[PDB]
């Protein structure tokens, strides 16, 4: 068979690329990391260098806290037992505050008050990671679009989490810690508002991830089917159109007659992405505050069959 | 109203067309379902009652 | 004389000709069906 | 009708059958062998729903099921208007499926680029043929398979999931489920990063790749490359729809109990199964 | 292209060879297509004998859908 | 707020439902108004503007500022080919392929084409030449894999046609982009490491048969490469899979020849 | 009417030939459907009561 | 209607020939499924409740 | 005089002559099956 | 024996043209084998088809032979 | 004299004269086809 | 049906050929399935 | 089977190949009708 560019059929190794100085504060970055040649049969062989800036230093120690929280947490749930905590490690919660306690942070330290101390640490890890996103692209005067991303991203974090308890007015709403029980935690939720299936912005979240699935597809196997002429380079033809932009362009229009840019497919990219964590964090703040049963919202909204 | 030719000095024609034809299709079958889905004026079941063809 | 398409005028008039031409016959077989089924069951 | 690049690329050849028969373009569209039978299949696949939304008795969109035979027709044939109009639709369906991956043969042919893109098509087609064909075929019955409405093909994943208690538990299920989401991220991303290289602040120069990787490796100390990062969503994609393949095909085959009885296996290992505490203990 | 040694079937009437060419494309073209019907039914009955060894029927699901 | 309904049974979730329907068939014009920066106004099969331009309009220019002071490129704007095309109308009606009228790998249309892009080398962020041969690259190396330098280079006619000398190395990426191969006559072309098989004792060459590397278009350089003579290396090499199919000596397409 | 010959020099004939013929076929296919639909006008079953096919 | 000749001064023959061929198959194929869903036109079964073929 | 396919108005009538023919006889054979069907099992 | 017009049916390389003569003969005896059995089958169908039309079933005569 | 295939007036007729006899002899072969089936279970 | 030839003027006889043979057998499997699909005439389900 | 070509040169070719299509086409008759024979396999007893 012909060369099909999943992997890298020779590996070639230089000086470790130090970055760009654009605005970077090099004393925050830090020595570059080990060549994994593993990674480098797929992708960069190079790990590092990381910048461990302010807003780093915080991300890192909150979300340190929290993993460490939830870690504590298991190990108390597993009788301090190696044995069991790696056993029931999929099995193990730490769930929110029962609901007769609401929003009041009054909640005993093991019946709700350690999900609240994880919850506190987790909130500033995510919020100061994404300062991290804004400012290591204002560094670099690149565009704040990951920023944004990861600003839907953590919409439909906040929703889940915070937004949602506070408007149901219990911090029981919220999705406990651990692999199972958030799991469960999700079935729960589709049980409890009838069938989250009939939920219209569900509907929408599924179909862009759907999307979003089928077009990082699409545009990876467009991308290799025209490296052979540079189109990984997509910054290149974004400046200078080469022909790898116009053979992708022209395979998509006679395929289904219409096409995209170099860079417009990067819009579509990043829009399709989105718009999964935007309406699915629309979809879960409906859910219970203005809909507590999405199939009879779906019978009064033609979408099922009876009524 | 005398200058409203000067639309076609600002608006293409050919795509004001094209818009214009999918839009009053769009709007006269619009109406039209509206009407079928109404008990009242669904003409196909006033004619089938005023004739009694339902049997 | 616009001429997005190239088309003169005297191509648009006979071209117009001929594609009326085809509009009456389909709209007279229309009208034909129409009666037909009129006359069959009425819808009025 | 043609791009301002696009005369050059309009050749004969790369036809995989008919030669020039109809190797020709309809507007923007390709046509070819495959695509006059992609056509075909689709326009009646649709009419053949439109006349099962006559049958059924309902023309609002959403209500529009055309529902498989039921479990009594087994594996053979039905009556049109109670299942047959399904087996149809879904030959129909497969038929224009794979003439639109041939078509897209064809046209990567002409344009002397790689077959990765029908490649990546027949992913998605053979997770399709998995969920009509491979697996009710299996399982002996047409109506283990999803009726083809909006909303009636959403209660058959509820009920298939819920046959199986949460169907969460299921293991393929969690890898396909991750690698979903991780290229969402991963897509989101690139696409993210991309347009900053391309659009950075107002009045600055546009970027270069050496930005991208700085600024990743500044987020996150790796970068993967822009080679990589299209490898790695092409593969991200297609390993969550094998995964969700082969879950779809072990579930009511080899599978048959609640799945989180399945991850009992871990628990019940003879060097921990019996230590009391934690949560099954 | 290299020229056959039996030379016994040239001796039919050009006209026979025109016939048999064309019944050549049409029955290659209906044996593709025959080649890709089998293929599909020989991959539907190997999954169909691989359910019969599996134990479906002992415990089968119940109708995922409302039958229609 | 469950069941408070303004009308009807619209409620919050129906007016977050139809407002979002709104968004998306927004969200779905701009992108494809920004799609339309590249290949527009749409051109007839001679080259005149066509009558059909499509229900998108043209968005309004932007200018990327482009790096290390190549200029500007404003999109949408006036862009033409800048290169003859020799393709011959097979048909006065439209949606009907264009005959080469020479030899198209020459000719560099179809699968062959290319495009007149800057003829300078592409650069990358400190502004030296991003794709520089491994000889000439400070410190690079092969890490894993097969080392393809010194190998034969077989064609798709099973002959070699030359051996590999150098790799021309991304410097940022550092990855290998193209090898270096010498002919018989002496002279070296560049062929993409994405069009050859780097196999355990020779690199395989799909793409083009051993006659052919020849006419591989050169580098007027021999330590840099710019983006037009990588773009019509790579067209040459890609158009060879349509163009020397006769060439190819490929199994099943012999049997399929036989009974075609 | 004088002067719609007129649109044949902003809408190409292919074009609208071709858009005309799908239009044509999608709404006279749409119509029969949604006349079949109905209990009444649906031929086939009138044909069917009316000469007792179905019993 | 003696004009209509020059339908193929507008449409080359071969794309008309192969659009008309694909669509009359497939509404010859749409009209037969038709008739095939409903229980009378049904060829095959009114023809096994003749010959009392099925149970 | 309009020019799109390269046929001469000779050329478009003989093959609109031949395509008329073999509408007609399409139509013929259509009409001959329909009569056999309304005969069989009348619709109307 | 008079030369084909066509001369397109002659572009096929003389092993395949071997190969479709072969066919053709095992094609000619299996067909003229197949018309014999389709007459036969035929007959036999003509003498149903009048046997039907005959009032047999109504009054049949009974067992010539000893059932065996 | 259209010739989009490169083929003449005669070579046309000549084709078209084999593709016929191979039409009516197929045509032949399903109409057996057909009688044998309607013989042993007819569908009308 | 006099000048019917003239299609093969038109549209190239090998090319069309080997479309019409996979056509036919299409056809043919189409009618044979639907012949399947209904309860007579479907020959393959031989029981006791 | 090396040498079974030269049994090509006592049998004429045409011959057999004319001879041996009847054979195959009676043998396959042959096989379909011992197959109706039996009330397994017999396909064309449709009942109901
Ligand atoms: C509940 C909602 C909860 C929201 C949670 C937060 C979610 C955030 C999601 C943000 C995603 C941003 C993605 C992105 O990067 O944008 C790229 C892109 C960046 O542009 P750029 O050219 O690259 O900028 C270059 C700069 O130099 C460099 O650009 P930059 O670095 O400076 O940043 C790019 C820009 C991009 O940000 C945006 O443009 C945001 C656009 C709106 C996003 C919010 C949509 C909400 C949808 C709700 C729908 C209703 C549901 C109920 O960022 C901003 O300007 C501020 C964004 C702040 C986000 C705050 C969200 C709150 O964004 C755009 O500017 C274009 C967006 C176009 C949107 C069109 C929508 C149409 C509106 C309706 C039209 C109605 C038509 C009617 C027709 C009907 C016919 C039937
Ligand atoms: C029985 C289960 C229910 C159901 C219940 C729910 C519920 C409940 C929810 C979803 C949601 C979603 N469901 Mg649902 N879902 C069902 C059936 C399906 C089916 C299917 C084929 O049946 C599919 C495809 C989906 C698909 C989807 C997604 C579209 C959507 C989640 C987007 C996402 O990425 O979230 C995952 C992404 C996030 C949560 C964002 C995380 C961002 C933050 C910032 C990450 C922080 C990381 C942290 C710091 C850790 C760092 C680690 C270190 C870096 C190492 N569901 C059935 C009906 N589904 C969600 C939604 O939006 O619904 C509208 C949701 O809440
Ligand atoms: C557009 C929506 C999609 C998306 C987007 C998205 N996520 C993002 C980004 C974007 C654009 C970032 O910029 C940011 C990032 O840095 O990515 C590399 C992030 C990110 N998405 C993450 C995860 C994540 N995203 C998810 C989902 C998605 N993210 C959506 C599908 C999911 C799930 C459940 O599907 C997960 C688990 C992280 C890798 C990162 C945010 C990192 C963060 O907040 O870290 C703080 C916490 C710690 C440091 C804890 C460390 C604990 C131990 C020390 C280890
Ligand atoms: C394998 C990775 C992902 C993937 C990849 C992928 N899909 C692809 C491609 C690729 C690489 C293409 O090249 C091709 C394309 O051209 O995309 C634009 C395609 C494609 N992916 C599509 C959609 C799609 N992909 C999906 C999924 C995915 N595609 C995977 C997640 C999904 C879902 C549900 O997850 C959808 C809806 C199309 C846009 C396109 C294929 C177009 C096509 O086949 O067109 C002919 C068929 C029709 C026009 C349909 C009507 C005619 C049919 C006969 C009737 C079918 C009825 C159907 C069964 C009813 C279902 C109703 C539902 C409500 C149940
Ligand atoms: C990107 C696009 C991805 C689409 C997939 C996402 C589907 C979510 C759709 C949500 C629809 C909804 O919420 O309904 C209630 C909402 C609001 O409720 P509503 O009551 O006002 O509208 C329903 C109208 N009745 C009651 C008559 C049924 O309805 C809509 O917004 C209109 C959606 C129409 C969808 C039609 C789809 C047709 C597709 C062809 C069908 C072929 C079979
Ligand atoms: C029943 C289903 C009907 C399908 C076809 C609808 C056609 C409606 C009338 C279109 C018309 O007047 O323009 C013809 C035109 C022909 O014109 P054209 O293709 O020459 O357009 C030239 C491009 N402009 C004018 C914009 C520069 O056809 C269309 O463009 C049809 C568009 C259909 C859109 C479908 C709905 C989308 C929402
Ligand atoms: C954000 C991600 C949203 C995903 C959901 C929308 C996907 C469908 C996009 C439809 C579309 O782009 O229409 C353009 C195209 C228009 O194609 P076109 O034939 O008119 O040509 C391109 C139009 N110009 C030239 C103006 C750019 O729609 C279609 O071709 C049919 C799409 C069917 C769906
Ligand atoms: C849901 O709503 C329901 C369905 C219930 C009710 C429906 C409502 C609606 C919205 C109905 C819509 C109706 C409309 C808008 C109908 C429009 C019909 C039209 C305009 C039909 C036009 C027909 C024209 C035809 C058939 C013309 C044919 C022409 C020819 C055969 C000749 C062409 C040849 C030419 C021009 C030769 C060219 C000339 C030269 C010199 C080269
Ligand atoms: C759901 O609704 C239902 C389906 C129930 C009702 C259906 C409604 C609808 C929408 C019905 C649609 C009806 C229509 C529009 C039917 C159209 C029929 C037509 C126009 C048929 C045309 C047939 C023409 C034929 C078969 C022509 C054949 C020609 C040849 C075989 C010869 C071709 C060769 C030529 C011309 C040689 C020329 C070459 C040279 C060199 C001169
Ligand atoms: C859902 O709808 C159902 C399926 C229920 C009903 C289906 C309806 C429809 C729409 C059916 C479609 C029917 C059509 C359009 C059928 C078309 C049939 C045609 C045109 C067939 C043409 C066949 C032509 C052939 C096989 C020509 C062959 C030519 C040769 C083999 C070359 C000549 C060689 C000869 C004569 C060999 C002579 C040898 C001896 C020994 C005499
Ligand atoms: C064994 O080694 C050790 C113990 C050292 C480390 C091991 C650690 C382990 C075993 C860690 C395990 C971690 C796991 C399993 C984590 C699972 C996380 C999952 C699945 C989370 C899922 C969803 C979480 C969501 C949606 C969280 C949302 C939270 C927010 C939106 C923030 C809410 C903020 C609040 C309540 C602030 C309240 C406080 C104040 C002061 C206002
Ligand atoms: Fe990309």
Redesign the pocket.
Same mark, same amino acid.
């Given at each position: 068979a012909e060369y099909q560019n999943i992997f890298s059929q020779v590996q070639v190794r230089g000086p470790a690329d130090l970055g760009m100085t654009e605005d970077v504060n090099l004393a925050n970055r830090s020595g570059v990391g080990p060549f994994s040649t593993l990674l480098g049969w797929f992708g960069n062989a190079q790990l590092g260098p990381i910048y461990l800036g302010s807003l780093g230093v915080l991300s890192l120690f909150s979300g340190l806290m929290w993993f460490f929280t939830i870690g504590i947490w298991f190990w108390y749930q597993a009788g301090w037992n190696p044995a069991v905590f790696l056993r029931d490690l999929f099995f193990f919660s730490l769930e929110p505050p029962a609901p007769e306690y609401g929003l009041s942070f009054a909640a005993p330290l093991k019946e709700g008050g350690l999900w609240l101390i994880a919850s506190f640490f987790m909130f500033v890890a995510v919020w100061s990671w994404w300062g991290r996103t804004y400012l290591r692209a204002q560094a670099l005067g690149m565009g704040k679009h990951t920023a944004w991303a990861f600003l839907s991203a953590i919409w439909l974090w906040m929703v889940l989490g915070f937004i949602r308890p506070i408007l149901m007015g219990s911090w029981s709403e919220a999705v406990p810690y651990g692999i199972f029980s958030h799991l469960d935690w999700t079935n729960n939720f589709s049980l409890v508002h009838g069938n989250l299936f009939y939920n219209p912005f569900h509907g929408l979240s599924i179909a862009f991830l759907y999307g979003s699935a089928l077009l990082f597809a699409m545009h990876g196997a467009t991308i290799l089917a025209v490296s052979r002429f540079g189109g990984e380079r997509e910054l290149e033809q974004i400046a200078d159109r080469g022909t790898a932009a116009e053979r992708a362009a022209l395979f998509w229009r006679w395929t289904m007659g219409f096409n995209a840019t170099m860079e417009g497919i990067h819009r579509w990219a990043i829009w399709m992405a989105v718009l999964v964590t935007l309406t699915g964090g629309i979809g879960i703040l409906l859910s219970g505050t203005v809909v507590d049963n999405w199939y009879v919202w779906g019978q009064n909204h033609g979408m099922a069959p009876l009524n | 109203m005398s200058k409203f030719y000067k639309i076609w000095m600002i608006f293409d024609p050919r795509r004001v067309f094209v818009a214009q034809g999918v839009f009053l299709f769009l709007l006269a079958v619009m109406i039209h379902l509206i009407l079928l889905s109404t008990p009242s004026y669904n003409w196909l079941e006033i004619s089938a009652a005023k004739y009694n063809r339902v049997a | 004389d616009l001429g997005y398409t190239g088309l003169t005028d005297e191509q648009a008039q006979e071209l117009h000709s001929v594609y009326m031409s085809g509009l009456w016959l389909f709209s007279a077989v229309a009208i034909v069906a129409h009666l037909a089924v009129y006359i069959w069951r009425p819808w009025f | 009708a043609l791009l301002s690049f696009e005369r050059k690329y309009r050749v004969p050849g790369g036809t995989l059958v008919g030669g020039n028969l109809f190797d020709f373009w309809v507007g923007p569209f390709y046509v070819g062998f495959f695509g006059v039978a992609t056509f075909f299949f689709a326009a009646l696949g649709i009419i053949l729903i439109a006349w099962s939304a006559v049958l059924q008795g309902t023309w609002n969109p959403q209500l529009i099921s055309v529902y498989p035979p039921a479990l009594e027709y087994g594996l053979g044939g039905a009556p049109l208007a109670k299942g047959g109009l399904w087996q149809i639709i879904t030959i129909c369906a497969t038929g224009a499926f794979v003439s639109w991956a041939l078509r897209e043969v064809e046209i990567c042919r002409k344009l002397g680029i790689g077959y990765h893109i029908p490649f990546a098509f027949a992913f998605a087609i053979l997770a399709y043929l998995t969920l009509v064909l491979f697996r009710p075929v299996m399982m002996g019955a047409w109506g283990y398979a999803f009726p083809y409405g909006i909303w009636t093909h959403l209660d058959w994943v509820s009920n298939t999931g819920y046959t199986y208690g949460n169907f969460h538990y299921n293991p393929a299920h969690m890898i396909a489920i991750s690698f979903f989401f991780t290229n969402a991220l991963a897509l989101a991303l690139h696409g993210a990063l991309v347009l900053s290289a391309a659009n950075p602040e107002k009045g600055k120069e546009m970027r270069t790749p050496d930005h991208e990787d700085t600024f990743f490796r500044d987020l996150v100390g790796y970068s993967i490359g822009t080679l990589g990062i299209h490898r790695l969503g092409l593969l991200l994609s297609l390993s969550a729809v094998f995964f969700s393949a082969l879950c779809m095909i072990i579930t009511g085959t080899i599978w048959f109990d609640q799945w989180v009885d399945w991850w009992q296996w871990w628990v019940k290992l003879p060097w921990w199964a019996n230590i009391p505490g934690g949560i099954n203990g | 292209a290299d020229k056959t040694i039996f030379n016994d079937h040239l001796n039919t009437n050009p006209k026979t060879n025109l016939?048999?060419w064309?019944?050549f494309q @049409? @029955?290659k073209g209906a044996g593709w297509a025959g080649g890709v019907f089998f293929g599909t039914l020989l991959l539907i009955g190997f999954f169909r004998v691989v359910g019969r060894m599996l134990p479906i029927q002992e415990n089968q699901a119940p109708a995922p859908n409302i039958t229609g | 707020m469950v069941g408070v309904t303004a009308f009807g049974n619209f409620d919050l979730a129906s007016l977050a439902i139809y407002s979002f329907w709104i968004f998306l068939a927004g969200l779905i014009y701009y992108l494809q108004t920004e799609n339309m920066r590249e290949g527009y106004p749409l051109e007839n099969e001679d080259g005149t503007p066509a009558a059909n331009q499509g229900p998108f309009p043209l968005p309004k220019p932007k200018t990327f500022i482009l790096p290390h002071g190549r200029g500007t490129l404003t999109v949408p704007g006036p862009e033409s080919e800048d290169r003859p095309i020799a393709l011959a109308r097979t048909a006065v009606s439209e949606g009907f392929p264009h005959a080469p009228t020479g030899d198209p790998m020459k000719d560099g249309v179809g699968p062959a084409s290319w495009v007149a892009r800057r003829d300078l080398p592409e650069l990358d962020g400190h502004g030296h030449n991003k794709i520089k041969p491994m000889k000439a690259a400070a410190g690079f190396h092969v890490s894993a894999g097969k080392n393809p330098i010194g190998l034969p280079v077989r064609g798709c006619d099973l002959e070699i046609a030359g051996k590999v000398v150098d790799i021309w190395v991304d410097i940022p990426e550092q990855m290998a982009r193209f090898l270096e191969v010498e002919l018989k006559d002496g002279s070296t072309r560049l062929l993409p490491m994405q069009m050859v098989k780097v196999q355990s004792n020779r690199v395989h060459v799909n793409a083009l048969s051993s006659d052919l590397f020849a006419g591989i278009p050169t580098i007027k350089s021999p330590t840099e490469v710019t983006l037009l003579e990588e773009d019509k290396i790579c067209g040459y090499v890609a158009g060879g899979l349509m163009y020397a199919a006769p060439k190819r000596k490929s199994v099943v397409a012999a049997m399929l020849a036989e009974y075609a």
């Open positions: - | - | - | - | 016939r048999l064309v019944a @049409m @029955m | -």
